[PDB]
Design a protein around this ligand. Sequence first.
Ligand SMILES: CCCCCCCCCCCCCCCCCC(=O)OCC(COC(=O)CCCCCCCCCCCCCCCCC)OC(=O)CCCCCCCCCCCCCCCCC
Ligand code: HEA
Ligand code: HEA
Ligand SMILES: CCCCCC/C=C\CCCCCCCCCC(=O)O[C@H](COC(=O)CCCCCCCCCCCCCCC)COP(=O)(O)OC[C@@H](O)CO
Ligand SMILES: CCCCCCCCCCO[C@@H]1O[C@H](CO)[C@@H](O[C@H]2O[C@H](CO)[C@@H](O)[C@H](O)[C@H]2O)[C@H](O)[C@H]1O
Ligand SMILES: C[C@H](CCC(=O)O)[C@H]1CC[C@H]2[C@@H]3[C@H](O)C[C@@H]4C[C@H](O)CC[C@]4(C)[C@H]3C[C@H](O)[C@]12C
Ligand SMILES: C[C@H](CCC(=O)O)[C@H]1CC[C@H]2[C@@H]3[C@H](O)C[C@@H]4C[C@H](O)CC[C@]4(C)[C@H]3C[C@H](O)[C@]12C
Ligand SMILES: C[C@H](CCC(=O)O)[C@H]1CC[C@H]2[C@@H]3[C@H](O)C[C@@H]4C[C@H](O)CC[C@]4(C)[C@H]3C[C@H](O)[C@]12C
Ligand code: CUA
Ligand SMILES: [O-][O-]
Ligand SMILES: [Cu+2]
Ligand SMILES: [Mg+2]
Ligand code: NA
Ligand code: NA
Ligand SMILES: [Zn+2]
Lengths: 84, 58, 514, 227, 259, 105, 94, 48
Amino acid sequence: ASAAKGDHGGTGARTWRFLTFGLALPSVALCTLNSWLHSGHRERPAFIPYHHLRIRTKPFSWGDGNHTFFHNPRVNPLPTGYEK
Amino acid sequence: FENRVAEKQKLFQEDNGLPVHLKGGATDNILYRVTMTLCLGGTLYSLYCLGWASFPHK
Amino acid sequence: MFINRWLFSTNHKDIGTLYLLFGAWAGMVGTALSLLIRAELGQPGTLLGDDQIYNVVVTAHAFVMIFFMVMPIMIGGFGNWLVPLMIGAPDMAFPRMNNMSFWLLPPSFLLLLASSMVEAGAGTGWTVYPPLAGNLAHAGASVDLTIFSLHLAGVSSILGAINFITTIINMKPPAMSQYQTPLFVWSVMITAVLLLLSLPVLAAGITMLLTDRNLNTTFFDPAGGGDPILYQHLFWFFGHPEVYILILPGFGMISHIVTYYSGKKEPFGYMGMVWAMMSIGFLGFIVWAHHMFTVGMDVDTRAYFTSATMIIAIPTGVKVFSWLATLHGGNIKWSPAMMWALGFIFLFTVGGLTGIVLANSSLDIVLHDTYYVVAHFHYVLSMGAVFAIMGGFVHWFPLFSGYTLNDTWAKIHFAIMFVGVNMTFFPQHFLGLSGMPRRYSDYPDAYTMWNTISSMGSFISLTAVMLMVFIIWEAFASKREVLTVDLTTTNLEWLNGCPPPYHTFEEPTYVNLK
Amino acid sequence: MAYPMQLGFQDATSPIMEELLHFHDHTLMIVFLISSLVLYIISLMLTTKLTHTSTMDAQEVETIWTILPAIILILIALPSLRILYMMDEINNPSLTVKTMGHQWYWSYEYTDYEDLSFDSYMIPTSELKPGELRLLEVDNRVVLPMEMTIRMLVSSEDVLHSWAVPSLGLKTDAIPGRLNQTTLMSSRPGLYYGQCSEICGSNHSFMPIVLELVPLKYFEKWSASML
Amino acid sequence: HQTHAYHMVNPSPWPLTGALSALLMTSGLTMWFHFNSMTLLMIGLTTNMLTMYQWWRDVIRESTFQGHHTPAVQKGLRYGMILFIISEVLFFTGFFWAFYHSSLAPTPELGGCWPPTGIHPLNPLEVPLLNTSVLLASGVSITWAHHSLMEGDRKHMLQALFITITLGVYFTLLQASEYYEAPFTISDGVYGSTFFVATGFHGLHVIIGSTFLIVCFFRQLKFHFTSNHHFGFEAAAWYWHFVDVVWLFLYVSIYWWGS
Amino acid sequence: HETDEEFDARWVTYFNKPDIDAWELRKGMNTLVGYDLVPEPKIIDAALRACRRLNDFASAVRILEVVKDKAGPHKEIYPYVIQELRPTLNELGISTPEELGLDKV
Amino acid sequence: ASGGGVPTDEEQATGLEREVMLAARKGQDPYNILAPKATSGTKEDPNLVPSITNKRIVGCICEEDNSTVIWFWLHKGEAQRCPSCGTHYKLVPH
Amino acid sequence: SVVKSEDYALPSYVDRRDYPLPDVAHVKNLSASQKALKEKEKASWSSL
Ligand SMILES: CCCCCCCCCCCCCCCCCC(=O)OCC(COC(=O)CCCCCCCCCCCCCCCCC)OC(=O)CCCCCCCCCCCCCCCCC
Ligand code: HEA
Ligand code: HEA
Ligand SMILES: CCCCCC/C=C\CCCCCCCCCC(=O)O[C@H](COC(=O)CCCCCCCCCCCCCCC)COP(=O)(O)OC[C@@H](O)CO
Ligand SMILES: CCCCCCCCCCO[C@@H]1O[C@H](CO)[C@@H](O[C@H]2O[C@H](CO)[C@@H](O)[C@H](O)[C@H]2O)[C@H](O)[C@H]1O
Ligand SMILES: C[C@H](CCC(=O)O)[C@H]1CC[C@H]2[C@@H]3[C@H](O)C[C@@H]4C[C@H](O)CC[C@]4(C)[C@H]3C[C@H](O)[C@]12C
Ligand SMILES: C[C@H](CCC(=O)O)[C@H]1CC[C@H]2[C@@H]3[C@H](O)C[C@@H]4C[C@H](O)CC[C@]4(C)[C@H]3C[C@H](O)[C@]12C
Ligand SMILES: C[C@H](CCC(=O)O)[C@H]1CC[C@H]2[C@@H]3[C@H](O)C[C@@H]4C[C@H](O)CC[C@]4(C)[C@H]3C[C@H](O)[C@]12C
Ligand code: CUA
Ligand SMILES: [O-][O-]
Ligand SMILES: [Cu+2]
Ligand SMILES: [Mg+2]
Ligand code: NA
Ligand code: NA
Ligand SMILES: [Zn+2]
């Protein structure tokens, strides 16, 4: 593809700054908007003690051995279920 | 900021026989001594830890 | 000055010397481990203990021989000493990074030694397959120390690979194209490309094993939807290129030794030798699952891996016949190095041919995990890689040291070793064909006779190893200094004298283009 | 089983093992021939004072020693792959038997009809009966009907093992979470021995396999009595 | 005195301190995993950072201040960096192989399906898509920085490099928040294993690449780069494009195809 | 492509060059002995006479030794070559290695 | 806003890098970056081999595409010949 | 006669059956009688 844009003649800083501010950062701004609209917590699902999940073959080397490193009490149940 | 590369070039090309890792001055020697002391003392400590871990501890 | 020179080195020759000393010390460790193996098996019954102590020994034997003896000696040792001299370069591209490749190896070895001292050691096989190597069947620090040992050895070799590739591409005389560089230099370049591509995949696989053991991942644990066979693919994706890494610098040294002691200015068929090493390197990446013919693989996959593996015989045969064509018409000098190289050509070929037997997946069903595999790879490693190491060591010892060996003692040493390795390993073909498994500390009674002979052979090789140490001592003790070396016009590494000065090629060679 | 001073394969007990023997004979002849030719040429190159040290043209002779090895490989690959696919062909078993590897013993399950299963452990050397084989006998053998196509399914409940019977040409890895299939057909009654063939820890050397091949009617009555 | 153009390096202690830092970090991880202690690990991490600092400090002294980087030396460093990136590609290839192996053949323990029963993947159109636009945008801004440097434009080099770094930081902060918010963990079977180890090593490389860009930023502030000689900047840009491309493979494979 | 006779004549011409120098004498002989042949008497004749023009008796003797060496186990070649060279040996006063005792070990 | 502020190599290159740059501008190659082009190599027109001492190693690629390089020390004084092809070389110390 | 380590870059003598005419003479320095012998060698070798 030629994409859909189209501006050479001797490539340069001016063109890449043009791309940075005229395409790249606007796209980041659009995606930032899209993401802030769709954030907001989702219902945490019923806890089911599936045996292929919440694996514990050795205690973790931190904490009480039973909490993952970026444990989030709201959405990460322990092997026994969500914390109080 | 002003461009002071020229004075650094003079400093690091001074004909004083120092190796490049010590050629900045006395701070190089201090940082070297700290690095090497941590490395050698840490290595001795790792050997102590091996000694400890090589035997059962009830 | 001593610390500056030997701990802070940026010199390709001194760093090569460090690697040779390290690899020689590792070779003693690996030899002792091999004698413990063969002592356990030298009569029926149990000598040392059950299969755990036995297979900690077996596992350490392999890691020591491969990672701490062969690769440091061939690549770190002969590679650092010879490659810059053979292209007229003033050092390696990254001379200070080069020194870190060396100094990562004593810590890697310490970690392996630690693995065997803590808990009950890592009794896993050098392949370290889960779940035996996982945290339930090998609970405790030993396997993790083994993983970290491999991590450090892997970083060492990957940075060394970057160094050798850069040096060989970028630091030749401007008139010298890649098709005017010696075959040993080619062999090191191709080995380095294999190292660069394969070791990161090993590193990925052993890191997954580390996280399965310590962070509750389940890459290889079916309870989490993982698969032990995935580990095997990642390991052997590295592990087949690895055996070509172990032999390629050997092929390069053999080309130089055969050329030199045939009184020739050049190997027969130079571009065919380059082609063959590149072809072997390439085909060595697409055959790894011949280590997995019994794991439950589909028939069409078995057919592909059978055929792709067998193809490697064609470029390898070009090299064997080109060595014979180099001898042809030579003024043969029956030096000790030549004896090592002639033994290499024959015994490597025997081991390559039993590898072709094993490539046939239908026969491999019966031969896999038996001593027939052990016989195959000890012919290519103990009578191939090691024969090339000994040949190169004897040939270039006067360059590195400035002193000569006693050639009569060196021929005695070759003779003893040749009897020893063949007595050790030839009977293991019979043990494999008749069904003796690998990694056994004891065997059904029927297998006694060949196990007894094999163990007696291993003691003859011990006597050869001890005599080697005396021979090196005698050379340094007597101090016969080199005078003239012939054929310098086609062996540039000798042209600066013996030993060469600390700095060579400060003025580069003159090579014009025409 | 292997016998003292044995040099080659155990005698074939299955047609597929007989095919492997003939294919091995074919391949070994080629191995011997090439090894001996290389040894002979080495000796030829080394036994004359005549010399020729100027540059030698390589192009013509490299055709020979590329084409001849390619032809030889094809002469190996053709019968090799024929046995591979014959090994793989559909056969329709009469019976399925599972074996599960464990540290350090095998269990067997025959659940086509009834729930039959048992463990099979090495006989300790101190308990061998006179004339029994050290490290090879088990307490409960894998009784099977002779002259019949059997599906063996192989897995493990702990680490890797590998279920091997050399005289039937069988070796199938025992992998937890995986159910590997192989087929077994004995042309003869008898006792056929094998040993665990993947390193599995402290007693890897000591968890053997013993098949006992008998007529169907004996196998049926044995099966019923093992319930 | 030499009459070739290559660099004979002064005898240096950093190879040894680097190797010993590797011993201390690995024996330190062992001590942490098995003997409940972080002591050796913290020493190893410290000596590793000191080693890297003084080693790359010395490379700057040798080139900007002492003039040892002739064109032949620079060409070697170019090959060195390309080969290093190749090795890192193969390292990630092993984790992509693990991901496809497990997801193309989901085992019964998973429910025989991908994503596994009980796994609720992130929506690839929310933060993962935003992270994709961020790294892509930073590939554009680092290219602007490169062209400004070659054209001799100090201010716009600094502006563009600052924007590139800001986007690298933004990606890292977004990824950190996504890690915390994720309802699955590294212990959630092979789904969590492949997800976090692969994106985790990717995140480490983003941090490494961001740090490298920040080093270039301060060397640029100190006028080290000329409009023609600035290999440290080129190497950091190549590494940055490598980090961007690995992300696109992760996004397509793990976040999108594997959802 | 070159017949035997053409090869021999090139080599005769090489050694016959009146002002051949010492370096060219050695280059010629050390190159020639690399080939799979014992040089024809007419080639050796020209090389010996080059030795004479270069006032080098020792190299003439050495050339005779290398003729014997190139024949290997074919013990008939060297006495034949010496027989053919006897008029030149007599004319130039060249003693054979045998006449000088230099065949003794 | 096309401005400046980035030093040039001409302004700021130093040490050996600067030596190489300044010599290349004069068309000189004191640090051996280029392959020298051969003369006819006769005794009358020998290849002239610069050196900062009184001997230098020569490698002779005797014919185009030879993979074998012929290596020898070239000493100050009378021209020497490649031992394989005879082409002449003469040291020019400076 | 005497070969020295510091001569390694100079043309050297070798006895090699396939390099019959080495790059240097075995003996470079001549006594009075050996000089007279090399003069006599310029005359008919039949008179030696
Ligand atoms: C090749 C390595 C160098 C040799 C090393 C040691 C040399 C030992 C000889 C060894 C000298 C070579 C002769 C090898 C065959 C001898 C055994 C045999 O009859 O083999 C039979 C087969 C299976 O066949 C059968 O099922 C039928 C059984 C028939 C029984 C007949 C009774 C035989 C009497 C007992 C023999 C005792 C064996 C001695 C035990 C030997 C203990 C060391 O076993 C096998 O396949 C073994 C597979 C070996 C594969 C590697 C091949 C390498 C060939 C190199 C030779 C080059 C030139 C030789 C000349 C080579 C000279 C260097
Ligand atoms: C130096 C190391 C090295 C080398 C070079 C090789 C080379 C080869 N190997 Fe080997 N191999 C190992 C070291 C090596 N191997 C190791 C260590 C293992 C076991 C790992 C473990 O499980 O621990 C092993 C395992 C191994 C297996 C797995 C067996 C099993 O576990 O069941 C197989 C199967 O195909 C194999 C095949 C081959 C082949 C075909 C070659 C070929 O490259 C050989 C090609 C050479 C020739 C064929 C000889 C010369 C050729 C001629 C004279 C031409 C004419 C020949 C013909 C026409 C055939 N090897
Ligand atoms: C380079 C690799 C290498 C080498 C050289 C050797 C050498 C030897 N090996 Fe090794 N071996 C392996 C790699 C090697 N081995 C591997 C990979 C395995 C499989 C491991 C596993 O199953 O997991 C294995 C397995 C293995 C077993 C099978 C164990 C089992 O299945 O239970 C046996 C048993 O006999 C054995 C024995 C020997 C013996 C007697 C030697 C002897 O030949 C050793 C004799 C001595 C030497 C060869 C000299 C060594 C030293 C030097 C060369 C240094 C020289 C110094 C200077 C040059 C200055 N080995
Ligand atoms: C379980 C945890 C295990 C952890 C193990 C950690 C092990 C090692 C500790 C590492 C300490 C590193 C210290 C800094 C090293 C910088 C090397 C470098 O930058 O090397 C450069 C060459 O490599 C180049 O370019 C390109 C190559 C750059 C490599 C940078 C360092 C990478 C180290 C990790 C590599 C891992 C590869 C992984 C792939 C799987 C320069 O080479 P020198 O010879 O120095 O100089 C030559 C002079 O002309 C320069 O003026
Ligand atoms: C180079 C190879 C190195 C291999 C590395 C292997 C791992 C090493 C970490 C082991 O370190 C040891 O851990 C012990 C357990 O944490 C400590 O004892 C501590 O715990 C003991 C047991 O409770 C008590 O006796 C003591 O009070 C207390 O010091 C001990 O001091 C420490 O050194
Ligand atoms: C101080 C310097 C002026 C150039 C010079 O020193 O001659 C200017 C020019 C570019 C500036 C940087 C760039 O414009 C990008 C950044 C813009 C932010 O708003 C402030 C920090 C920021 C990082 C600036 C800091 C500082 O004002 C810089 C670095
Ligand atoms: C072994 C590897 C699977 C690794 C995995 O399970 O993770 C698979 C992936 C792609 C496969 C290949 C591709 O399917 C293409 C080929 C298919 C042929 O039927 C067999 C050979 C063939 C060349 C395959 C061999 C082997 O099964 C491969 C390479
Ligand atoms: C063309 C190339 C290089 C020739 C040169 O520039 O000198 C040569 C070197 C090695 C050669 C190959 C090897 O000699 C091996 C094979 C020999 C067969 O006779 C032809 C194909 C064959 C695969 C050759 C093809 C080709 O002539 C190659 C690849
Ligand atoms: Cu079970 Cu080995
Ligand atoms: O690996 O063969
Ligand atoms: Cu392999
Ligand atoms: Mg197996
Ligand atoms: Na035993
Ligand atoms: Na640039
Ligand atoms: Zn020439």
